Amino acid sequence: GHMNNLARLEPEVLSRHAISSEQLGIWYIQRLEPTCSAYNMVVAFDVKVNQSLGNKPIEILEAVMHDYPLLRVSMPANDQGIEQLIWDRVYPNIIFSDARHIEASDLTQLVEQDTKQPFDLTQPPLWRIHCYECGQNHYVIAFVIHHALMDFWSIGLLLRDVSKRFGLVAESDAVNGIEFVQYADKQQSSVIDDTDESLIFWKNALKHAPHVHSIPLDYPRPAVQQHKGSSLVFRVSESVSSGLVNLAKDYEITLFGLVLSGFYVLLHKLSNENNLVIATPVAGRLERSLRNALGQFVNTIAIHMDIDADQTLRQFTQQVQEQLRQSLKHQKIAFSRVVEAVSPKRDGSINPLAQIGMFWERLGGMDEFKELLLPIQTPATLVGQDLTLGSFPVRQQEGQLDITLEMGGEYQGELVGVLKYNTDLFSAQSAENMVQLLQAVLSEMVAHPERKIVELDIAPDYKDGIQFEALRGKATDYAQHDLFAMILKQIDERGDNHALTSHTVSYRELGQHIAGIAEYLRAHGITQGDRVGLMLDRTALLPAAILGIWAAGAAYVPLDPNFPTERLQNIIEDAEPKVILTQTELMDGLNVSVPRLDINQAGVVALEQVRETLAFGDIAYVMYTSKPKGVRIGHPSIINFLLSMNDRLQVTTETQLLAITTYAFDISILELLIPLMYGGVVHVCPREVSQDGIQLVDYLNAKSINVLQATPATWKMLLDSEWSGNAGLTALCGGEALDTILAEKLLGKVGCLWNVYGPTETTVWSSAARITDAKYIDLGEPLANTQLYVLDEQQRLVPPGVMGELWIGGDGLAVDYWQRPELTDAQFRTLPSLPNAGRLYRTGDKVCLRTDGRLTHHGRLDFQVKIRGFRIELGEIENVLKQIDGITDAVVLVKTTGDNDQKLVAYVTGQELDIAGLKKNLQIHLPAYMVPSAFIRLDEFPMTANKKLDRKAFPEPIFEQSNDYVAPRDPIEIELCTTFEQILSVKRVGIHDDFFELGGHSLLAVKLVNHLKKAFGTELSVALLAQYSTVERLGEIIRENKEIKPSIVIELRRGTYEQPLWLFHPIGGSTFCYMELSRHLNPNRTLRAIQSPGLIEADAAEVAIEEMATLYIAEMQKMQPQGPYFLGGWCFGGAIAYEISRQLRQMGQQVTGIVMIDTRAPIPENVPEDADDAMLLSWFARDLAAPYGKKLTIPAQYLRELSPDQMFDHVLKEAKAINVLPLDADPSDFRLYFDTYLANGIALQTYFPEPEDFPILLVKAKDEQEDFGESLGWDQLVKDTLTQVDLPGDHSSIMYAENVVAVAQTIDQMYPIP
């Protein structure tokens, strides 16, 4: 053993101190997430020794521990505060392991693993040393200090002092290792009132600062931050580094000033937000008396820049330097204090106020060590007589924020930096991107110093004219091919084989039907260029009609008969068709001034006889979409589309496609034609079957389909039926976003799955993704002769990792919007930015260009996904809901409320649901900012005629503004409430009020938790309180826990006066009736109330009052062993007080007085009427709810009709339904209440004390209708010493807020305290 001669001894505390406010925040984070290593400071060395080193290391270590008290510090959390304890002695935590067998690559990983082991800041030491034997006289030494204990400036002082001790440097400055606790103490004897001019500065600085930054993430953000992260080391070139130095001097700014400005500009371009908040450390060592002190002095300041893209870099950089200069005036105010004052919404998913940092450190005086402290390895050594030090870089302090930029170092003319990134949010490829973008910003800054921020472009020199070569589609001549010729060829070749299946039509028969329809049309006025309305049912004539209309030279305009007549009529108005091809039934359905042809009258004609006359025209169809927008599509688009689709689907003679989509939706083009291009079979699915889950499942298992295309809706319908899947099926899902849940479900049921995307204006689909893993969904890669561009609002190309608007170019563009040329000219453009792109369609889709060539969809621009600044990943919320058992489908929308405020609304459908528990579920899987403010259940989500979700149709939500007040309903909620009220100084806390929203803040939480694990006697944590911030939610957690029984004593108020007032429970056993009283009593008096054991442990309620009283007096005396006692109670509690007084005086104790609030004297006359079990249960139900001002009337006669077990269930169900029992109350819990009621009843019936003269304040409820005498009987027990006051109220309401104030004040006037 390497510590054989150090020896372990028993440490004792020398002195207690405060923690500085600079330590409080880091301490709290460590206590909030115990496995956090993000504040493990590491400095490590390659150490070669000589024989002469000897035992000097232990000798020196022991000397250093003696010299600097700070190293023997612990930070335990105690009563009403966190403490800094200096121990006389600490056993050093030195770990020595054999690494002689470990390759150098692995050794680094190992040291990084080892140093991340988390500290408990309450068990010393808060530092440790890791040694590795690498070879003989060859070691790696890693020193690890928790940042709560000291800062890097301190590390420097130690490094230099300890180096001198080992004889590595000649000189060392004096180090002070005791000043910090003094500094801590003098600090926490000071206020920082909310009037402090610096505190006001930060509130103003940060008031309008966003909740969370809008950089797009790679992953979905965890509900609770786990501080996992990684680091990327990079260097800025000598050219660009020198440039920066000079540019800074060519302005009036710090180098740091410059680079920070660079950083903001980067985040501006990355997130496209103009409000940005970056956090920077400050040394916090202005007082020179501190410049040699070991300690944690570093404060964080949150700089909040407003970016004006119109600013020149020069103007803007200076604007930063200035604000930075102002902010440094107010660095004295701790970040924890700023967070307290600003009071942002607490959210366990992010750091408050700021999630991006920039550290700039150079640290002078460390001249010999400068290269030994870089993030990169250097040949630099320190040679001493006994040993040599060498560079050993290890990744350290990862996970603090979302992103932290760490800079200040320089090496061989190059600025050295470390990009730190949270690995739960960002991929490594994204980090590299960020570094590359950062590099680009600094270059373009020294290049073009006078340029306007907006005109500055970070994005890669896309020399090819494309952002990635993926986003450009394979070049062919598909758009030149003849579609008609292919189908004609198949008609010759395939012969009498099947073609359509509705009454099966052969290819030969199909040719006849095309001829016959085309000829019929020709005969009745139709020519090339005309437009034919097409109003048909899903028969075998449908595809024949399309091809017939085409062969006649005409274009068809879909008029689906299932669409609303006024919708059909609007299209017909706009499209102005020459005729409408329809069937016999439908001829005079529409009231339109447009001729109609019964397609059933078209004959069959031999194709041979009319082939010369058959040609396609230029236009294929006019398809309408969301005034009416008819998109005109030409045949070269369509043939380009179909051929490009065959490339993927590999359509063959044995292909068999179930066509289900309306021909009034362009994607039907694929389903109706592409088998006919290759000899396969189109199955025209009848509308009824496509809209009926089981009926569709049936037609699938039967007719042996191997290709199916549909929108998500149909797939969901299919899965919601008992569909066994089809492992040969090729599936296409398009038209709407494929969420990860459907994807993982589809994948397990289908052979091949395609996500397929495209607007109508670029011909069915433009791109397609072969989906293989649900966690990776995107818009795929382009079809042939198609190009995809992601542009900003300036129609410039975006940098990778940035969101923009998708634009599409290629052979797929529409001809135009039908007779809407202004619109066409606005939507179909060439762009100066893309001069080789040609004509482009502008989708109005929000698409993120990934660091990958991947396009991920984020849905439109007309749809608001912004709230309070930051933006919402609506799909991530939806994904969670769907995973909840019961929920079948969910849609989350952003909606506006009253004063231009936006809130999340979640719509759900499902078999059986409990809206109540939904919010609690989401709370523990999403960030706070992504939790919906409203849950609306629907039977079915509204669809479009296309079978997509019709978001515009979802009902507008109605928000509950304030949270409804609800009084605590059980002993746990009762204590929790009192505890909240007291700590927050809030007069009255409801069980749905949230700790932090009531004014709570992080240091208070620690107090609260400390108060609780005394009051409950178990280990509660600040994480629990963080995640469960309401009495209700927290009550649940505590309650579920079988290892925690409360005390029968509740402190309602700790006052200053010596003497407590003790209150005793009424018949029910609870102390709720005293809560409101306690709020109006003079707060200088301590109040304690006792509840029955019976409410906590089973069969524990006492049944004789005399025994009850003894038990309670013992409980009392543990807190108040002597003095004269002050007792009282409402109702039965008064009688308990009477008997307690009797026993107290038999013990020689004095009783100052008894408060009785409408107590009926314990005399025979006042005993209740005899009740059967039903009546007792009826009474209990009444008395249970009365304290809450609620009337719960359960007639004994109703109860007698039921069996006993049915009775208790009935009362329980009824009590819960008016909210006077917690929602999770088992029958077990209910028997606890009822049994206590029964016990106290029996006690009442057997208690009849002899007369006795105690000083009694009898407060009579002067409005109670039941008669018990002027004195409620007390004149028979107490003659001379009874003071009676009659006050407004009845026996119950006397204790209600309106009436109980006068009760409280009667007491305070009668039993005064200074």
Ligand SMILES: CCCCCCCCCCCCCC(=O)OC[C@H](COP(=O)([O-])O)OC(=O)CCCCCCCCCCCCC
């Ligand atoms: C957090 C502050 C604490 C300050 C403590 C002062 C430095 C004390 C370093 C103590 C390391 C103890 C390791 C040890 O006892 O092993 C002796 C080892 C040979 O062991 P063995 O194989 O004979 O059993 O032989 C060796 O491995 C010797 C290695 C010596 C390394 C000296 C490092 C000098 C640089 C100081 C930098 C301080 C930075 C904060």
Ligand SMILES: Nc1ncnc2c1ncn2[C@@H]1O[C@H](COP(=O)(O)O)[C@@H](O)[C@H]1O
């Ligand atoms: N696979 C897909 N993923 C996401 N959005 C899609 C997909 N396919 C189509 N869309 C959207 O659906 C729109 C159709 O236009 P509209 O009929 O006006 O809703 C397109 O412009 C796209 O925004």
Ligand SMILES: [Mg+2]
């Ligand atoms: Mg569309």
Ligand code: NI
């Ligand atoms: Ni050892």
